[PDB]
Amino acid sequence: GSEFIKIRLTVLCAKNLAKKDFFRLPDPFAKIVVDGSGQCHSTDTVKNTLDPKWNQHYDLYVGKTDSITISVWNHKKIHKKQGAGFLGCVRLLSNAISRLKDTGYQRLDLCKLNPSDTDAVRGQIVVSLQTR
Ligand SMILES: [Cl-]
């Protein structure tokens, strides 16, 4: 009937994120995008931590070829130039969504936007995808 599947994404926490500013811990939040529909969500910001615990879930409507991209950002850098405060991402293509769904919480290593990028990215994000 609909050409989509409802997947509940829980963004549980991240751990061991990069500390880019020596004297100043980030205030991390995650941003979630379903690439084909453009569906966009953000978690709350957690103050002054490399190990933010968000425990927030989102009902994503994912189409047959859509992916889910989750990126982590230091909100203290919100006014700085575009792309500052980047702390890593993960991209789940439709095959990975198919594999991971209903397998429980997964520790996913955060990646640079591209393998060859300079950005210091460290640590993991912990998420689950469930079919609803
Ligand atoms: Cl940062």
Q: What's the 41 CA to ligand 1 centre distance in angstroms?
A: 20
- The structural domain count of the chain equals 1
Pairing of strands 28-34, 39-42: antiparallel
> 3-state SS of the chain: helix, strand, coil percent to 5?
10, 45, 45
Resolution limit in angstroms? 2.0
Provide the residue range defining the domain that includes 26: 1-132
Q: What's the 7 CA to ligand 1 centre distance in angstroms?
A: 30
Whichever domain contains 56, its CATH number is 2.60.40.150
Q: What's the 87 CA to ligand 1 centre distance in angstroms?
A: 6
Q: What's the 84 CA to ligand 1 centre distance in angstroms?
A: 7
Q: What's the 61 CA to ligand 1 centre distance in angstroms?
A: 30
Task: Tell how far CA 73 is from the center of its chain.
Answer: 9
Angstrom distance (rounded) from CA 93 to CA 88: 17
Residue with tokens 């640590």: 123
Angstrom distance (rounded) from CA 3 to CA 48: 41
